[PDB]
C-alpha cells in the first residue's frame, strides 16, 4: 500500500518536540486560521471551533499592554512573506497577560508559490519580566507564571535551572527547536511520495524487482548444478566453472547486504523506513540461514594450500548450497495469487525434482557396482545393465570404464522421468535391494506430484470456463422455460436473440454490481462519465451544478433497445422521461406514424408541472439499435426539490420532443375519401340520443 | 450482432452532403410533419417541438408575397404522389422573405404503398432576385442574403464564384444532389437487412461457414501428411499425390482472396462494410503469414527443369506448410464457448501430436543407424531392435533394408501413444543418447497434455452435474431439518413429495429469475402469454385494454396445488382472488361441502367494493392437481385505480363463484333428527339470561 500523499501535519508533529502552533491561509484576506493543535488550545484556553476563522496575527488575543509597533511589524512580515521571531505580550480567555515567542514561517507550494502560514508559540513569562493587573501577591503571580511555562523550562531546558544566565543559552536553545522547524516546515503541503532515507532501496522498485529475478535465476542454476557436481564428479577440471561459482557466491553476498538495507512490509505497518529496525527484523527472520548458504568454499580452499583431509571434507560441505532456494518464498507469496504462473512453477519443480532424483539414482548406481572390496561387478544394478545394452561393457588389465559421463546422466534423467510421469518404459529399471526401495519412494513421491499438477490444471480450466459456463446454463434454463410454457415460435426466438445480444455487448458484466463495488464519489464520477452524452449535448444540463449533475447521474439508467422493440405501449404508465443519445425511434398512434425521434431528442411527460401519472397516448417503437438514457420521475422530482434554483432553469430549458400525455387530432385520407363518396348517395329516433347529446354538452363545461 | 432494421434517417444523412429536410405522414389529413433535422431548424428558425404537427406544405411559413398558384401546385403534387421541384418565397420566424428550392419526394413502403413524404430545401436568395420589406440599405440586404445562403454557395458551388452564369450549371448542380437524394430517398422505411456491397461475402453466412469448415479439414489433412512426407519419404512416386497437393495449394490461394473480400467484426464496430478498409485490416493482421504458407512449391519445381541443388533445397521449404493451421484460430474463438466440443478438439490435438512425435521418432531412428561413415549398424537404436523383433534384420552384398515402410510408421505411432498416454509397454523403448532425451521431452509434454485432457473432462462432468447436485443437496438439507425438528411422519412426507413434484414439473427453473433476466416489454408479453387461460376464458377481461392486461399480467402469480392440499383455511386473511384455469376444488364450512369449483371458476372476495380485509369463512381444499391463477388485492386495486373506465366494467362482469367472506346458514340432518326425537320427551332462572337476551336484541339494531 503506497501512494502520493501530503503528510503535512505528521511531519510537523514529529519535529515539534512537544510544542504548539496554528495554520492560516496566506492568499485569503485577514489571514484566516484554519487549524490549531491541542497544545495551542491548552495554552490559549479556547476550543478549536472558536479559534478558526480568526486572524493568524491574533486580534482577539491583543489588549491594552500589547505593543502596537510589534503588531505593525508582524503585519508587515505577513504582507512580505518572511521568516521572523518576535516576543509579544497577549491575553488569554481568562485575561492573564503572557509573553509569547512567536516564530512565524511562510509555507511554499509544489507550484513554488506561497499558500499557507505557520506560527509556533512559546511562553516567556518567567523568563522575560513580571507584570500583573490583579494578583493575591508577587509570589502567587510567579507561581502562576511557572505553571504556565512548563513546556520550555520542564523538558528542553532541564539542565538550565542549575546554571545561571538562561537568556544567553537556554531560551535561545529553545528557539533553536523552532529554527529546526523552519526547515521541517518546508514540506510545502504538496501531494508527495513517501520519504525514505538514503542508502536504502524500496520494496516495490523496478531495480529491486530485477535484482530479485536475477537472484531467482541464480538459485535455479545452483539447484540444477550443485547436485550434478556432487554426483557425476567433474572434479574441477576447468577453472572457469570455479570462477563462475565464486561469482555466484559474491552475488549472493551482495544480495544479503542489500536485504539488510532494503524496506519491508508488515501486517499492520505497510511501509518500514527505520534502517536499524529493518536490520534487526532481518536478523530475527532469515539472516543466519542465508549467510550459511552463501560462503565461498572453493575460494577458501584455493589459497591456504593446506591438509588434504581438511580440503576434501570441506568440499563435501557444498551440499548446503541446495538450501539457497529459500529466496524463492518471496515470489511464491508474490505470484501465488495468479493461476497460470502456478502451473509453470509446478512444471519447473517437476523438472528440478527429476534432475535431483536422477542424480541420486546415479549416486546409488556408483555405490552399488563397487560395493565389495573383492571387486565384484555383480551381474546386476541398473548401471551395469545400461552398459551391457548401449555397448562398451567393463573389463580389466585396473578397471576400464564402460559408458560415457554425459550419456549416463541423460539415461538417469530419463529413468527418473519415467518413474515420475507414470510412463514406466523399463529399459532402465530397478533390480537390487536399495535400488528397488529408492524406486518405490520415487513412485510414491512422483504420483503425488503428478496428481498435484493435474489438480492445478483442472483448477485453471475451471477458473476460465466459469464465466461462460454459467451463461450457457442460464441460456439452457431459459430455453427449457420457453419449451415448458409453450411460448410462440417468434416471441421466444426474439427473447433468445435479446439474451444473446446482451451477452455479446456486455461480455458478461453486471454494471450495477460493478458500481456497487466502487465507493460513493468514484461511483458518482463513473455515472457522470456514462451519461456524458446526455449532459454535454442537451441545453437543460449546461446550467446545472456539479452536485446536481452527480445526483442526476446516480438515478440515470440506460437502455439498449433492439430494432422493432417498443419502449412505451399505448395505455402504459409514463413514469420516466427518456433522452435519445443515439439511434432512431418512431411514435405510432392509431397505427400511424406521428413523430420520428433521432439523436439528441427527448420524450416522456412533464412531471414537475402537471404532477400526476398519465396514460401513454401512443406506442413508441425503435427503428435501429437505439441507446436510451431514462430517469424515473420520482427520483428526478426529488432531485429538483433538492436543487430549487435549478428546477426553474430546467423547466425553462427542457422542451420535450414529444409528450406521450397529449392526444393528436387527425383523420386518415382513405376515410375522408369514403366520406366524400358517401356524400353523393343520400328525427323520430332523435329523443333517446338527444338526452345523450345534452349530457355530453353538460359534461363539456 | 445483426438484425433486420429500418435505417431510414441514417441513409438520408449519408446522402445529404450537408443539407436539410423534413418528414410528414402521407395517409394522415393535412400532411402532418413528424420530423425535422437540425439544419432545417437552423434555417427556418424554429425548435423541433413547434415545427411538428404542422402541414408539410408549410402554411405557417407563407405570407403576402408568397404566390398562391405555386402553393396550389404543391398541394396538387401532394395529392397525386409525385416527385417535383419548386422555387417558392416564404417567411421565417423573424419575418425575412426567402426563396426555397423545395425538392418534394413521396416514399413507398415494403408493402409497395406510399406512406411518408420527404421535402429537401435550399436557399435561392442571392441566386434568384432581391426583394425586401424593410432594410438599412441594399448592400445590407445583400449581405444578409449571403449569410443565409452559405450551404449551397460555400461548399458545393465553391468553383462557381469565379466563373459566370451560375444559374446555367451551379444551381442546377446543387439541385443534382437533391436528384441523387430521390434515389437515396427510396429506402421505403422498411425493416430491411444490412446493406452490403456486391463482390463481398458475409461473416456469418451458410456458404462462408461451409468454406471455413472445408479449410479446417484441409488444414488438418496438411498437418497429418506433410510431416509424413518429410520423414518417411514417399519421394513423389505417384503424381496423384502431387496433383492433390497442388489442388490444396490452389484452394488455399482462393481462400486468401476470399478473406481479402469478406466482412469483419471489431469490438466497437459489429459489422464492417468498407472493402478497402477490410483489405487493409487483413494486411495488418494475418496476410503475410498466410501467403507464406500457401505457395505451390511442387508446381514451381515441376516446370523449369533446372538445378538439382536448387530443387532439393527448395523441396525442404515444404516444412512451412505446418504453419497452415493458423486458420484454426477462427473456430477456436467460435467454439471455445461450448464445453463438449473442446474435448473433441483436445482429442484431435492429441492424435495430431502423436503423429508428429512418431514422425520425429522415425527421423531420429533414420539419423542414428547410419550416423558414421564407416557404416556401423551399432547393435542399438529402437529401429534396429524393432527389425530384430518382427523378423527381417539388416544385411549386405550395398545395404538391404529390414522392416517395411508401412509397419515402421505404425510402430512409431504406437510408441508415441505409449509415451503420451502413460501406458509405457516398452517393446519399443529409448536406448541411445539423443533418443533418450527425446523420450524424456515427449514424456514431459505428454503428461501435461494428458493432465489438460483430464481437467477438461472433469470440468465437463461438473458443468452437467451442477444443476442436479445442488437440488440433491437441497433435498438432503430439507430431510435433515425434518429429522432435527422431529416433524411428524405424514407432514414431512407430504413436504418431501411436494418438493420432488415441483422439481419434476419445473425441471429446475426459477420462473421469477427468468422473468427478471428478460427486459420490461418482453417480460410483460411473457406474463400475458402465461395467463392466456385467464384472460381469454373469463368475461371480465375481454373488454380490458392491452395496457391494462399487461399491468395485470405482471402482478398475476400462478400456483400448482396438490390433491388434498388446502389453499385458504377458515380464519386466514382473504387477500387475493384466485381464478381456476384447471382442476377441481371443494369448499368446506363446518366440515361440510358447500361448493365445488371447477374449470373457469373464481373465488376470493370483492375488495374494490367492500374495501376491508375479511376473515376466510371456510376451508378450501383441492381435489386434483389444480392450477390456480391468483392476484394480490393491493396490486389489483392499484391497477383498477389506474384504469378508471375499466374498473366499472370489471365490477359489472366479475361474479365470484363463491365469496369466502359470507357465512352460509344451514343445519345438518342428523341434528334435526335428534331434535325431532327430543321433541316427544318433555322461568325462575330466566332473569340472569333475560338481561343477556335484551343486550343481544339491543346489539341487533
Ligand atoms: C512434492 C510436494 C511439492 C508440492 C507439494 C504440495 C504443495 C501444496 C500442498 C497444499 C497443502 O494444503 C497440502 C499438501 C500439498 C498438496 C503439497 C504436497 C507435497 C507436494 C506435492
Ligand atoms: C501442449 C499444449 C496444448 C494445449 C496447451 C494448454 C492450452 C491452454 C492452457 C490454459 C492456460 O491458461 C495455461 C496453459 C494451458 C493449460 C496450455 C498448456 C500447454 C498445452 C497443454
Ligand atoms: C556373472 O555372469 C556371467 C555370465 O554372464 C558369469 O560367467 C559369471 O561367473 C557371473 N559372475 C559371478 C560372480 O558369478
Ligand atoms: C554387435 O553384436 C554382435 C552379436 O550380436 C557381434 O557379433 C558384433 O561384433 C557387434 N558389433 C560390433 C560393431 O561390435
PDB file of N, CA and C in Angstrom, chain B residues 399-433:
ATOM      1  N   UNK B 399      23.382 -52.190 -48.878  1.00  0.00           N
ATOM      2  CA  UNK B 399      22.735 -52.442 -47.576  1.00  0.00           C
ATOM      3  C   UNK B 399      21.240 -52.756 -47.729  1.00  0.00           C
ATOM      4  N   UNK B 400      20.872 -54.017 -47.486  1.00  0.00           N
ATOM      5  CA  UNK B 400      19.488 -54.481 -47.627  1.00  0.00           C
ATOM      6  C   UNK B 400      18.631 -54.019 -46.451  1.00  0.00           C
ATOM      7  N   UNK B 401      17.449 -53.484 -46.755  1.00  0.00           N
ATOM      8  CA  UNK B 401      16.526 -52.985 -45.735  1.00  0.00           C
ATOM      9  C   UNK B 401      15.845 -54.100 -44.960  1.00  0.00           C
ATOM     10  N   UNK B 402      15.467 -53.799 -43.718  1.00  0.00           N
ATOM     11  CA  UNK B 402      14.835 -54.768 -42.817  1.00  0.00           C
ATOM     12  C   UNK B 402      13.318 -54.659 -42.798  1.00  0.00           C
ATOM     13  N   UNK B 403      12.770 -53.691 -42.034  1.00  0.00           N
ATOM     14  CA  UNK B 403      11.322 -53.579 -41.868  1.00  0.00           C
ATOM     15  C   UNK B 403      10.638 -52.794 -42.993  1.00  0.00           C
ATOM     16  N   UNK B 404       9.341 -53.042 -43.175  1.00  0.00           N
ATOM     17  CA  UNK B 404       8.557 -52.411 -44.242  1.00  0.00           C
ATOM     18  C   UNK B 404       8.211 -50.963 -43.906  1.00  0.00           C
ATOM     19  N   UNK B 405       8.051 -50.145 -44.948  1.00  0.00           N
ATOM     20  CA  UNK B 405       7.772 -48.709 -44.801  1.00  0.00           C
ATOM     21  C   UNK B 405       6.464 -48.383 -44.060  1.00  0.00           C
ATOM     22  N   UNK B 406       5.473 -49.273 -44.150  1.00  0.00           N
ATOM     23  CA  UNK B 406       4.144 -49.039 -43.580  1.00  0.00           C
ATOM     24  C   UNK B 406       4.150 -49.420 -42.094  1.00  0.00           C
ATOM     25  N   UNK B 407       4.727 -50.588 -41.818  1.00  0.00           N
ATOM     26  CA  UNK B 407       4.760 -51.148 -40.478  1.00  0.00           C
ATOM     27  C   UNK B 407       5.495 -50.209 -39.532  1.00  0.00           C
ATOM     28  N   UNK B 408       6.622 -49.683 -40.013  1.00  0.00           N
ATOM     29  CA  UNK B 408       7.531 -48.881 -39.212  1.00  0.00           C
ATOM     30  C   UNK B 408       6.816 -47.677 -38.641  1.00  0.00           C
ATOM     31  N   UNK B 409       6.073 -47.001 -39.515  1.00  0.00           N
ATOM     32  CA  UNK B 409       5.309 -45.801 -39.131  1.00  0.00           C
ATOM     33  C   UNK B 409       4.337 -46.127 -38.027  1.00  0.00           C
ATOM     34  N   UNK B 410       3.632 -47.243 -38.219  1.00  0.00           N
ATOM     35  CA  UNK B 410       2.629 -47.719 -37.255  1.00  0.00           C
ATOM     36  C   UNK B 410       3.285 -47.944 -35.897  1.00  0.00           C
ATOM     37  N   UNK B 411       4.436 -48.608 -35.938  1.00  0.00           N
ATOM     38  CA  UNK B 411       5.209 -48.925 -34.742  1.00  0.00           C
ATOM     39  C   UNK B 411       5.569 -47.645 -33.990  1.00  0.00           C
ATOM     40  N   UNK B 412       6.051 -46.678 -34.767  1.00  0.00           N
ATOM     41  CA  UNK B 412       6.463 -45.378 -34.248  1.00  0.00           C
ATOM     42  C   UNK B 412       5.298 -44.702 -33.543  1.00  0.00           C
ATOM     43  N   UNK B 413       4.150 -44.738 -34.216  1.00  0.00           N
ATOM     44  CA  UNK B 413       2.921 -44.134 -33.697  1.00  0.00           C
ATOM     45  C   UNK B 413       2.545 -44.763 -32.382  1.00  0.00           C
ATOM     46  N   UNK B 414       2.625 -46.086 -32.336  1.00  0.00           N
ATOM     47  CA  UNK B 414       2.311 -46.872 -31.137  1.00  0.00           C
ATOM     48  C   UNK B 414       3.190 -46.429 -29.981  1.00  0.00           C
ATOM     49  N   UNK B 415       4.486 -46.308 -30.286  1.00  0.00           N
ATOM     50  CA  UNK B 415       5.477 -45.894 -29.292  1.00  0.00           C
ATOM     51  C   UNK B 415       5.117 -44.523 -28.723  1.00  0.00           C
ATOM     52  N   UNK B 416       4.786 -43.625 -29.645  1.00  0.00           N
ATOM     53  CA  UNK B 416       4.425 -42.256 -29.292  1.00  0.00           C
ATOM     54  C   UNK B 416       3.217 -42.241 -28.377  1.00  0.00           C
ATOM     55  N   UNK B 417       2.229 -43.053 -28.730  1.00  0.00           N
ATOM     56  CA  UNK B 417       0.989 -43.172 -27.964  1.00  0.00           C
ATOM     57  C   UNK B 417       1.295 -43.633 -26.552  1.00  0.00           C
ATOM     58  N   UNK B 418       2.166 -44.641 -26.461  1.00  0.00           N
ATOM     59  CA  UNK B 418       2.578 -45.201 -25.172  1.00  0.00           C
ATOM     60  C   UNK B 418       3.219 -44.116 -24.312  1.00  0.00           C
ATOM     61  N   UNK B 419       4.097 -43.343 -24.946  1.00  0.00           N
ATOM     62  CA  UNK B 419       4.806 -42.257 -24.282  1.00  0.00           C
ATOM     63  C   UNK B 419       3.815 -41.241 -23.722  1.00  0.00           C
ATOM     64  N   UNK B 420       2.840 -40.901 -24.557  1.00  0.00           N
ATOM     65  CA  UNK B 420       1.849 -39.872 -24.229  1.00  0.00           C
ATOM     66  C   UNK B 420       0.883 -40.282 -23.132  1.00  0.00           C
ATOM     67  N   UNK B 421       0.202 -41.389 -23.403  1.00  0.00           N
ATOM     68  CA  UNK B 421      -0.887 -41.887 -22.578  1.00  0.00           C
ATOM     69  C   UNK B 421      -0.436 -42.451 -21.218  1.00  0.00           C
ATOM     70  N   UNK B 422       0.876 -42.548 -20.992  1.00  0.00           N
ATOM     71  CA  UNK B 422       1.457 -43.006 -19.723  1.00  0.00           C
ATOM     72  C   UNK B 422       1.284 -44.516 -19.523  1.00  0.00           C
ATOM     73  N   UNK B 423       1.115 -45.232 -20.636  1.00  0.00           N
ATOM     74  CA  UNK B 423       0.966 -46.679 -20.620  1.00  0.00           C
ATOM     75  C   UNK B 423       2.360 -47.272 -20.467  1.00  0.00           C
ATOM     76  N   UNK B 424       3.209 -47.008 -21.459  1.00  0.00           N
ATOM     77  CA  UNK B 424       4.600 -47.433 -21.444  1.00  0.00           C
ATOM     78  C   UNK B 424       4.763 -48.933 -21.420  1.00  0.00           C
ATOM     79  N   UNK B 425       4.496 -49.564 -22.558  1.00  0.00           N
ATOM     80  CA  UNK B 425       4.689 -51.003 -22.695  1.00  0.00           C
ATOM     81  C   UNK B 425       6.180 -51.333 -22.716  1.00  0.00           C
ATOM     82  N   UNK B 426       6.902 -50.714 -23.646  1.00  0.00           N
ATOM     83  CA  UNK B 426       8.346 -50.891 -23.765  1.00  0.00           C
ATOM     84  C   UNK B 426       8.801 -52.071 -24.610  1.00  0.00           C
ATOM     85  N   UNK B 427       8.041 -52.404 -25.655  1.00  0.00           N
ATOM     86  CA  UNK B 427       8.556 -53.243 -26.743  1.00  0.00           C
ATOM     87  C   UNK B 427       9.540 -52.376 -27.502  1.00  0.00           C
ATOM     88  N   UNK B 428       9.025 -51.248 -27.986  1.00  0.00           N
ATOM     89  CA  UNK B 428       9.836 -50.165 -28.499  1.00  0.00           C
ATOM     90  C   UNK B 428      10.117 -49.289 -27.293  1.00  0.00           C
ATOM     91  N   UNK B 429      11.391 -48.971 -27.085  1.00  0.00           N
ATOM     92  CA  UNK B 429      11.796 -48.144 -25.960  1.00  0.00           C
ATOM     93  C   UNK B 429      13.130 -47.441 -26.216  1.00  0.00           C
ATOM     94  N   UNK B 430      13.340 -46.266 -25.585  1.00  0.00           N
ATOM     95  CA  UNK B 430      14.542 -45.479 -25.861  1.00  0.00           C
ATOM     96  C   UNK B 430      15.803 -46.069 -25.227  1.00  0.00           C
ATOM     97  N   UNK B 431      16.848 -46.230 -26.036  1.00  0.00           N
ATOM     98  CA  UNK B 431      18.131 -46.776 -25.583  1.00  0.00           C
ATOM     99  C   UNK B 431      19.299 -45.787 -25.702  1.00  0.00           C
ATOM    100  N   UNK B 432      19.370 -45.048 -26.811  1.00  0.00           N
ATOM    101  CA  UNK B 432      20.530 -44.194 -27.116  1.00  0.00           C
ATOM    102  C   UNK B 432      20.406 -42.771 -26.560  1.00  0.00           C
ATOM    103  N   UNK B 433      21.514 -42.037 -26.640  1.00  0.00           N
ATOM    104  CA  UNK B 433      21.668 -40.683 -26.062  1.00  0.00           C
ATOM    105  C   UNK B 433      20.571 -39.665 -26.450  1.00  0.00           C
TER     106      UNK B 433
END
